[PDB]
Design a protein around this ligand. Structure first.
Ligand SMILES: [K+]
Ligand SMILES: [K+]
Ligand SMILES: [Mg+2]
Ligand SMILES: [Mg+2]
Ligand SMILES: [Mg+2]
Ligand SMILES: [Mg+2]
Ligand SMILES: [Mg+2]
Ligand SMILES: [Mg+2]
Ligand SMILES: [Mg+2]
Ligand SMILES: [Mg+2]
Ligand SMILES: [Mg+2]
Ligand SMILES: [Mg+2]
Ligand SMILES: [Mg+2]
Ligand SMILES: [Mg+2]
Ligand SMILES: [Mg+2]
Lengths: 117, 206, 202
RNA sequence: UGUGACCGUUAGCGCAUAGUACAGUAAUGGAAGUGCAUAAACCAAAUUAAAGGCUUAAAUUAAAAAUAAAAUGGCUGGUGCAAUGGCACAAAAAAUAAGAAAGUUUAAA
RNA sequence: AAUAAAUAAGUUUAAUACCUUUUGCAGCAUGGACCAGCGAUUAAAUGCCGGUAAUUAGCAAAGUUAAACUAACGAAAAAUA
RNA sequence: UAAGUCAGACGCAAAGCUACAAGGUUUCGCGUCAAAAGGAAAAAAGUCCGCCAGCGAGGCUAAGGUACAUAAA
């Protein structure tokens, strides 16, 4: 069981008797910590959902689809993840379009260490 | 002070010699936390009510018969093996050149505490004669000793007579006469004794 | 941390209290003064001695020994209060103790052989630490307490400690010299004690 | 009188004096209550925050000291510290027994 | 069930107290208005089973108590002579 | 372990009793709950997928889904 010092440290921002009354605050502290365990798990699901929405919106502006892009990347051996792809569509439109064109049309110029073999 | 000095402030016991007691009813995460490990309800979990031997009403232990045979009184004698008697002689704790009596056995340590007498039993292969006086003997011991040329005598002593045999100094230091020997034994014990013991035994050569 | 010869006899000089000078030399048996030091045996004997000295004159009162409390204080049913049977119950302020204290002894037993092992360990430890000294006598040539203190200080100058323990052959020993030593020793001396060899303990 | 890994004002005797106050026709039952000091619950008060342009080359200092919010006002009497109060036995002393029945004993110089 | 996880600070999503008792309780089953103090497997003797040591134990002081032990089939032949 | 337990529940599949009724009752085979958080079906003890030591804004899948609510043709 938490001590008085621990209980009141956790409950410093609670309302009414939940702030300074031990019996009321103790039950409010434990229930909140239970919410936090669930909250951390759900955070990872929600953020990935947001990335996909932004990628899909960018793809459809050019006439493409999210599912077509993911399949196309795996055929080209491109391993950029969704967090990076989401950020490219928002902040680097020109680079995001270049990735789409390579996947759809494959018209990029290859680079070799020895330019003149 | 150096590190190797010993004082009252750095003593500990040997590991494993002690273990902490279990104090129950002291928290959810403690051993035997809430209910003290007794369960939830019932007669067992309500204090001193039930004896550990009650079987529910069947009472199976008293469904067996009773025997009333009386064991022989000779279970009250101290038992001495012939093989143990020889070992003492070989080590030198007993003198085999003179008659051996129960007093010598008591002092040598063969017999621990005598209240009634000594019973001699067992088989042993001897090469030298032995003369021993005891209160009782079997047939295996008699044959073993006599085969080498010894003599086994069963001597009859009373309660007062046995005390004089074992602790004569207890009477001389107080200037008291020794107990007198018995006259004869009851005929019901015929075939149990060969002679009446003398409080000061007569030692002979072997 | 240094080399020790176990079970070997020791040669120890003898000093004089009156002047602090060496007078002769003697020998210490190796089985008593050069034995192994058992740390666990010392712990057991120390606990054994402390338990024996505890007095144990302590008592409390339970609900049957507190004054009053015979009658039932409330009706069993109807009042809306908790059911109660007596005012001297442990649950009530001013009630009895659930498990009262009783006058008791705290002493337990040890074999006489284990006590011997402890004494040898303690004597051996002193010799290996250089805290053991032998003198011819304590009262010969000394007529004042200050004189004795100065002599003892000179003899034990090569040591780390401060307090001293003095062991003699008892009051009726050395021609009743012990009586003189007791008289000279001041009352309530916190750093000096005198014991007979019969009362030596770990 | 002596000792304590016995207690320190919800403890220890019911009592740091009280078998008092008080309840009851009565027998009887039976409290509270030491000294000092920013503890808790509890009720009132306390919301916010802004700022846009003097021209720069020969000071001062025996010695030392001296510029900054952890804490509102109350009511209450916990905790911490102390003992002119209790608990347990120990030592000494005291108390105590006779066979006989109107009858003799036991006194150290 | 008055919070949690985040946020461009505008908001968005997750989310029916605790205890006791039950096959099953957010329970329209039970207990708690709140704070401080008090409040519940303790002691003795004996027995059983693990662990750690002593290497019999207690008195006494060359002698005594307590415990423990005490006959089962005398069965081997390994010689490069 | 000389411990606890001897109030059990439902789903699919059989039989007796009831009326080839009951979230009924009595046996029996497997599973789940009881003592099991997480995902799907609206809320969801017992159905379907699957067993939580802790943290992370990495990735692949199961049951079930892929015009809006609501991630994906
Ligand atoms: K148990
Ligand atoms: K309150
Ligand atoms: Mg039950
Ligand atoms: Mg039970
Ligand atoms: Mg009291
Ligand atoms: Mg106080
Ligand atoms: Mg009081
Ligand atoms: Mg029910
Ligand atoms: Mg209520
Ligand atoms: Mg039953
Ligand atoms: Mg049943
Ligand atoms: Mg049913
Ligand atoms: Mg249950
Ligand atoms: Mg995938
Ligand atoms: Mg969508």
């Amino acid at each position: 069981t938490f001590s008085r010092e621990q209980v009141f440290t956790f409950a410093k921002n609670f309302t009414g008797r939940a702030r300074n009354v031990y019996k009321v605050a103790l039950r409010r502290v434990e229930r909140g910590l239970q919410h936090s365990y669930v909250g951390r798990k759900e955070k990872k699901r929600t953020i990935r959902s947001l990335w996909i929405q932004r990628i899909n919106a960018g793809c459809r502006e050019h006439g493409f689809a999210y599912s077509a892009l993911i399949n196309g990347l795996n055929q080209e051996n491109i391993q950029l993840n969704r967090k990076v792809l989401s950020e490219l569509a928002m902040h680097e439109p020109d680079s995001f379009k270049a990735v789409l064109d390579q996947v759809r049309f494959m018209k990029g110029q290859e680079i070799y260490a020895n330019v003149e073999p | 002070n150096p590190n190797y000095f010993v004082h009252l402030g750095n003593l500990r016991p040997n590991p494993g010699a002690t273990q902490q007691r279990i104090r129950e009813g002291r928290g959810l995460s403690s051993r035997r936390g809430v209910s003290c490990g007794m369960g939830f309800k019932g007669q067992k979990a309500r204090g001193r009510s039930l004896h550990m031997l009650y079987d529910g009403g069947q009472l199976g232990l008293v469904k067996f018969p009773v025997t009333r045979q009386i064991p022989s009184y000779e279970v009250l004698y101290n038992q001495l093996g012939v093989s143990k008697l020889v070992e003492f002689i070989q080590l030198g704790l007993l003198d085999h050149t003179k008659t051996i009596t129960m007093k010598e056995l008591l002092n040598a340590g063969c017999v621990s505490s005598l209240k009634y007498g000594v019973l001699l039993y067992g088989n042993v292969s001897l090469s030298f004669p032995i003369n021993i006086e005891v209160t009782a003997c079997d047939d295996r011991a008699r044959r073993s000793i006599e085969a080498a040329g010894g003599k086994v005598t069963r001597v009859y002593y009373t309660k007062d007579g046995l005390e004089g045999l074992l602790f004569p100094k207890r009477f001389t230091d107080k200037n008291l006469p020794l107990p007198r020997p018995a006259v004869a034994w009851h005929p019901k014990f015929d075939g149990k004794f060969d002679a009446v013991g003398q409080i000061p035994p007569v030692y002979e050569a072997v | 941390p240094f080399e020790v010869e176990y079970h070997k006899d020791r040669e120890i000089p003898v000093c004089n209290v009156s002047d602090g000078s060496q007078v002769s030399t003697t020998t210490l048996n190796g089985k008593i003064f050069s034995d192994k030091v058992r740390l666990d045996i010392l712990h057991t004997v120390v606990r054994y001695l402390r338990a024996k000295w505890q007095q144990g004159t302590h008592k409390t009162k339970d609900r049957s020994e507190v004054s009053g409390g015979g009658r039932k204080p409330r009706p069993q049913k109807g009042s809306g209060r908790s059911r109660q049977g007596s005012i001297r119950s442990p649950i009530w302020r001013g009630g009895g103790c659930t498990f009262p204290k009783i006058p008791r002894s705290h002493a337990f037993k040890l074999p006489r052989n284990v006590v011997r092992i402890g004494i040898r360990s303690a004597l051996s430890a002193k010799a290996n630490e250089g805290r053991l000294f032998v003198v011819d006598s304590f009262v010969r040539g000394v007529e004042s307490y200050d004189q004795l203190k100065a002599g003892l200080a000179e003899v034990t100058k090569d040591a780390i400690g401060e307090s001293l323990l003095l062991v003699d052959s008892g009051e009726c020993g050395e021609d009743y010299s012990g009586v003189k030593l007791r008289r000279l020793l001041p009352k309530d001396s916190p750093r000096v004690e005198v014991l007979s060899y019969q009362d030596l303990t770990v």
